[PDB]
Structure 1
């Protein structure tokens, strides 16, 4: 169609399948294998990207151009890399991915949304769609096209270090929350074939349903471990939300480190090719997790030639290497040259990778849009995160006896009040893992509002607000306080670091609560990624709120504490009496919860 130097795959008006086919048929083996390779920005240079025809880059947690980098520094870094890829013979743009799992959370100044567990407590799929929408804008503000989200694991044992990344122990809740997909990507057209990949354009990002499959069902919630359950249980609990993801056009799927009945997901041909591709008809690309193929073996990385063969024959399209690309590429090249991996397998992986790229508009907008930079931490997004924070809170107790005046909502006008606790004035702690660093961090790590700051923002100008991190019982008794707000709970963690068999919060926590509540009426705010041993904290407290990991917008906490809105959150998980009961899920054997799934007390808005 026209000028003599015309190349079909470069023609923006052509159908995606035709462009895919036209480009694929021009490619060398090297160009093909390069598309299947995703590398860390830490090992990328212009020469490496060109010489190896690299298909994709990522930032792992905390992999940033520098601390405190602006939206525009992110764009320039991404464009720098894109420039190199666009200079190859074929000029295939790379796609850059990142873990934007509660906002664009590696980035300084990015809005930080509550983690998924508290989103589950909202029972509000449309709220979650708006979060996907705002997250898309803030990822594009940094010039990135692909978010590794949503995690649609169904956590069945809160001892799991990634339990907070699961919306619920109940698959129906997880299914409903797959509305993050068309928020991140855009709504699919009414026509739309299930399993097709979709992204609306340059103001959206490709999403990723992860981690396929049963990552939530591991023995004793050990991370990356074995999920032991018959096919029926797998299909009834852990598989369903994958189909909702197919119907909403999720562009990519990430495979689990975990195994199903002793079989590593990263080597599972039956599930990856047989079920996901051949039965659900998924047509986007399938991506490994980080060194996912290495971990097929024991020890990890002890037979990488086998890691490559088994993962690629299982049906994975793109490998998150992410460091040793030369080895990955060499080994995959040798296996193809030797006839051990047929060309049809390579061609299918590349068809799928290219189909996502063409579909999302990546050949038409390979470069960042500088006018999107101001989306980062936009106040409208913060307002949305604040709403989400507030709706996620679950009120577990509001008064020690049925006859006490209920403590909450607290009055904004009082002569003198106490705010106390390790978590009352610690932004890092209220955000939890995957914020700025991989493991999260402590203190003022980004822009936001701590519980202390939110309290001072909320109260009457005549209310004197006293902060004390760990006050003793005397200080409280002598302080002339009207009430206290005390915030305690878990430290930040992610995945294996967070596997925890005792689920009891660190001290000083309980002791501060006892000291405070022994002197004056107290509202205890529990910051956690999951249910934790809570009876002693309940016994001390007049009122107690499960706030999960509410993110950067602490005024969501105080919006409810002070009665601007009623509490509406409901437990998206079972609250256990003791860890010895675990695992224990709604519908189970002898199901004996402290608070059942769906439990939450309510209040009404003041005035």
Structure 2
């Protein structure tokens, strides 16, 4: 009743103020948000008891200013592992915990809505923001997102799933027209958002920068209204990506309730003030008051539940120590062991020769709106020191000295905030020979960073190893292998890189991604086996970039794309590699363990409305560990073309001791089995195959069931 009451009290002008942000806080002419560093604020209306609501990034943790002027207090937040690493956990419960921790910091720092999680599909590994997205698969993505949203919103604050939809490249994102069939949309790109919307009920959705089939997402009625609302039954409000679109009136008409951050003229001289443009449109009858009321109601019906609406006295003192444990745990389960030829874990007291500048310049996460400002960030070297591991102390000082020297130099000093990539081959061929005799093992850090606004390139030093990185690995490998010793590589990266050319040169490979503030601790602990790797890939690692099915990336013309066509359609990520027989370097769902697991006791039953899959996993190794199991369904060929198989469920065991087992029981609604034929979802009659895998290509148990009667669903 409150909402309809406030609504009835508002004047036309106050209503317009409410659907437009107050401008980017603390930049240009604008005052700081009462939470300094926050991404945006709504217009207050004291008249009718509406406060300003505060919105802030981001996916890796709350992003606000750590300090404030005329203030002795401190406002640090927890920097969690990046989303691609969180997805690697394949652990819903854990993602929910990460949401709660973040949510407590959101609430207690006076924020009302967290601008997370990001959940665009990994269409192409070069997308600059892949690090802060979950997966190339909509079920993994949707399920991780749902868990995170539930976590955040258990804390009395709102989540915001973004970016809706098909924002799968950074190049010309604010302008590019994304051409995608309705089938690709419904099966791949819309699909994760559908799951999140239906299962977790996020307070808000952020419409994407890009056009979708001719229309800006922020101004796309089919997207924000027919699909989101009418079909899916979304009950929240939609906000625009910052400065997205070109027409505030079209945005409101489309179902984009909240225009952020407001004052677009401050960034684009050709935009009018949106309040003035809207007021004029109302005056002229270009926009009806009824549409305006709907947008305002969508906003209030959600935000009357925000802490700010009840004048919540936030503490400015969240439990950072408790949240750090959660960040460490998330990182611990998200590391992916890609290769282990009797190399890991390291023996106790093993003397480590630590290589690569990334050991010191460790990447905690990518740049942009999804960045964070934690009190600390434990480098790989620091974590190893902290845990008291036996490392070459002379070498570590050499690296420290070399980085200082290089970063002080003109060519490599941080510019404007990028740090030029350092040469990694500064050690002499004889210096490394000395290292091989002195130490027991080699550990080489390979680091990459990416971020909002920039796409990566299929070139050396980016997707490919730079020549100096290749030379370092070759030399270290040769030297240490001659001495009978093992070499380990740590991939401190945010998205796939080439691995085929060098992986056979080394014995161990740990994909440690970018693990936030606790990175070095997580990494050290994985090396010694205190952590048993349980992460599995949420995205495909291709042998070569030319293998990638999304070849049109980043569009036409390449250097200034006005449009990009998803030629590969539904056949993206593993759906492509499986269906057309292209072998990846490492497949979707792949990941090793320090122990072994045996799958057994498969039972499959379909009562016509629910597919029930049960099996048993036993730890047959000598170290406790968790196992991620994946259930792929292979639908019959029947009427329409379909991928080879599709992930429909997944699970992760508790921490099993040697000899322990766990019974897995998963249920899949019949509707989930459907393919979209362009008009409707269809679950074709026929024999289906259940494929329970330790990865999409390591199937451990197979069974079948039959659909007797075709089922159809209109969107």
Q: Residue 473 in 1 paired to residue 420 in 2?
A: no
Which residue is 1:94 aligned to?
52
Higher helix share: 1
Which residue is 2:500 aligned to?
535
Counterpart pick for 2:190 among 239, 243, 253 = 239
Alpha-carbon contact 2:128-2:456 (below 8 Å) kept: yes
Which residue is 2:252 aligned to?
312
Which residue is 1:255 aligned to?
207
Counterpart pick for 1:266 among 218, 224, 235 = 218
Q: How many Å separate the matches in 1 of 2:81 and 2:391?
A: 31
Alpha-carbon contact 2:96-2:148 (below 8 Å) kept: yes
Q: Which runs of 5+ in 2 are unaligned?
A: 67-75, 266-271, 400-423, 481-485, 550-571, 596-621, 625-715
Which residue is 2:476 aligned to?
516
Which residue is 1:496 aligned to?
453
Q: What does residue range 20-99 of structure 1 map to in structure 2 within 5 Å?
A: 20-38=3-21, 39-42=23-26, 64=36, 85=44, 88-99=46-57
Higher strand share: 2
Structure 1 position 169, deviation (Å)? 0.6
Q: Residue 422 in 1 paired to residue 357 in 2?
A: yes
Query: Using CA pairs below 8 Å that are at least 6 residues apart, which structure has the higher relative contact order?
Result: 1
Q: Which moves more between the two structures, 308-317 or 120-129?
A: 308-317
Structure 1 position 309, deviation (Å)? 2.5
Alpha-carbon contact 1:58-1:97 (below 8 Å) kept: no
With normalisation by structure 2, the TM-score equals 0.67
Counterpart pick for 2:317 among 373, 386, 396 = 373
Which residue is 1:167 aligned to?
134
Alpha-carbon contact 2:139-2:195 (below 8 Å) kept: no
Q: Which moves more between the two structures, 111-120 or 97-106?
A: 97-106
User: How many residues of Structure 1 are paired with residues of Structure 2 in the alignment?
Assistant: 516
Q: How many Å separate the matches in 2 of 1:135 and 1:44?
A: 29
Q: How many Å separate the matches in 1 of 2:584 and 2:283?
A: 58
Which residue is 1:215 aligned to?
167
Which residue is 2:547 aligned to?
581
With normalisation by structure 1, the TM-score equals 0.79
Q: How many Å separate the matches in 2 of 1:523 and 1:322?
A: 50
Alpha-carbon contact 1:422-1:509 (below 8 Å) kept: no
The verdict on how the C-alpha distance between 1:545 and 1:272 changes in structure 2, with shifts beyond 3 A counting, is same
Please tell me the root mean square deviation across aligned C-alpha atoms, in Å: 2.9
Structure 1 position 551, deviation (Å)? 1.2
Q: How many Å separate the matches in 1 of 2:574 and 2:390?
A: 46
Alpha-carbon contact 2:104-2:318 (below 8 Å) kept: no
Q: Which runs of 5+ in 1 are unaligned?
A: 1-17, 50-56, 66-73, 187-202, 295-306, 400-405
Q: What is the SS of the residue equivalent to 2:309?
A: coil
Structure 1 position 364, deviation (Å)? 1.4
Q: Residue 113 in 1 paired to residue 80 in 2?
A: yes
Which residue is 1:198 aligned to?
none
Q: How many Å separate the matches in 2 of 1:92 and 1:606?
A: 57
Alpha-carbon contact 1:321-1:328 (below 8 Å) kept: no
Cα displacement string for residues 4-58 of structure 1 (whole angstroms, at most 9, x for unaligned residues): xxxxxxxxxxxxxx11111111111111011111121125989x89xxxxxxx69
Q: Residue 322 in 1 paired to residue 267 in 2?
A: no
Cα displacement string for residues 432-481 of structure 1 (whole angstroms, at most 9, x for unaligned residues): 224xxx4859xx97412111111112235798584143433322221311
Moved segments of 4+, more than 6 Å: none
Alpha-carbon contact 1:388-1:556 (below 8 Å) kept: no
